[PDB]
Amino acid sequence: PAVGSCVVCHSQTSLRCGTCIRRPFLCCKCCYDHVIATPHKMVLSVSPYVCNAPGCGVSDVTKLYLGGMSYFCVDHRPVCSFPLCANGLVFGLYKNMCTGSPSIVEFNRLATCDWTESGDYTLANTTTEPLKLFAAETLRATEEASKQSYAIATIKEIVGERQLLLVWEAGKSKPPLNRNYVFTGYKVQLGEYIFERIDYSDAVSYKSSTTYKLTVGDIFVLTSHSVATLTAPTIVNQERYVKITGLYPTITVPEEFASHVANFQKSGYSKYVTVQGPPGTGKSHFAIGLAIYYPTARVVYTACSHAAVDALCEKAFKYLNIAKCSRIIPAKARVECYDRFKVNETNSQYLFSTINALPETSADILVVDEVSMCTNYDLSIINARIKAKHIVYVGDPAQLPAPRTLLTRGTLEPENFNSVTRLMCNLGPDIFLSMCYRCPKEIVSTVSALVYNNKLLAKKELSGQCFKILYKGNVTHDASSAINRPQLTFVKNFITANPAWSKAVFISPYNSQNAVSRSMLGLTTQTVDSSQGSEYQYVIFCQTADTAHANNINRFNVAITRAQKGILCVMTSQALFESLEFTELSFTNYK
Ligand SMILES: [Zn+2]
Ligand SMILES: [Zn+2]
Ligand SMILES: [Zn+2]
């Protein structure tokens, strides 16, 4: 409308800040505290607060006065007139009963910060529930406004169908050819486009909202997008029940899911349940396990990556009656997703969808997978689209968070990823998946005591092929992300003096160190990010340079736990080293 409730207190108001990126309602007290304490001096009501005299055009509430019934410049004001902005209040409708809040100072920060220091993202998650939304809107609003800052790309030459030659206009910084970046082609809108560099090279791979055939000399612009208005909270209000509501158990489970009826039932005695699942503990199993235990129920599976949502579709394909399954692909289809399920049949008993592609519907169970990789925006969008009797958050605050491409200075603790990991970390999880089915007992006991407080167990026994060395080596920055050849050279001698390890997989905290490892040892390489989901049978973690990013325990965990039988780790930090229950080697004895 244009009369609403203060986004800080709940008071009624007709005023909103006209230079904050999202124009939020502010009451007469909070608007005062906002404008005196911040560069924001433009106040909007039904009519903007500007000077009425012709051609004046000053819009600084600290300079506008009320004369008669029109607003006035200091130079233009009539004889008697009072300021719009004095006494601690801004001139609005409900001037009597605007209470205000001490939390106005948290607003002023959220409304003014550039989203670069990690201190701001922690506030965005510890604040009041209404400000949790404002932070989330403005965060996504500035992120889409930064798109127009990155440079544009022209097509120099076509190296093949379908691979291209990036050419990036200098004079403005150049965005990463990444999934987090969606370009549109061109004076005709050719479609949506996503990019990926082919084997660490100067050319780029290519998937799109197909199928236009590109002409050399085209353009790719990171198009800024529109940002929703958040109304549903990040987490719906919690309800405890005396009996399984809305859902109807079955008798009985097949032999496979019997171990999870205990937990499947819990998911029915509360409005929302939170499930932690370290790698290999089979969370996709648990998630489809619900729809088997409550076969009458409509369940909607959702997550962030099309990869995660496809991971659920697959586990569902072999356990569920594909007749009433549907994959919800948006109108703009850029990634090739699942194919065996029907498409866009918004009525089927089983729905699979990206959060962004969620349709407005309802469910008896809503399953949100990879919850750590969410943003509080993502949550509020889930609760707005899906009215649901139950919600089962499934994720792991020890694995990866969502990439926050604006954050440069700072470290975000896992307790402040979502409103949901904040719960999992302080209160603990409701369900915990404690049996690891993927890893040798050596590496699971190291994580189980590093990040899981020894709640995590092992099924595989020890493997022996778990090794450990404190080789510092020197680091060199040809590329900004670091490089350390002196310890890769150790790997070469290791692998050359070793047998099956040739089929190992290289995992380093740094995007460059992998690339050179492609030169010096030519193994299959995967970033710790590009390894969640996949599991490998021999891995080598070559950390580097003692940066924070390198000592990041969470990312450490996802890398290590890719292993099925064997692992070694050349370590650049003496402290983390002795936490690995792996057999140590030395430079003089790496036999
Ligand atoms: Zn403002
Ligand atoms: Zn207020
Ligand atoms: Zn004026």
Numbering used by the authors: 0 to 185, 192 to 596
Which sentences did the original study use to describe this structure?
Nsp13 is a highly conserved protein in CoVs and nidovirales and one of the two central components of the membrane associated replication-transcription complex, which performs viral RNA synthesis.
Intriguingly, incubation with a 5’-triphosphate-15T DNA (ppp-15T) greatly improved diffracting power of nsp13 crystals. Next, we collected a 3.0Å resolution native dataset, which we used for final structure refinement and further analysis. There are two nsp13 in the asymmetric unit (ASU) with three zinc ions bound to each N-terminal Cys/His rich domain. Unexpectedly, no additional electron density for ppp-15T DNA could be identified, indicating that a stable nsp13-DNA complex did not form. The MERS-CoV nsp13 CH domain is tightly attached to the Stalk domain. Residues Gln404, Arg443 and Arg567 from helicase motifs III, IV and VI form hydrogen bonds with the sulfate suggesting their involvement in NTP hydrolysis.
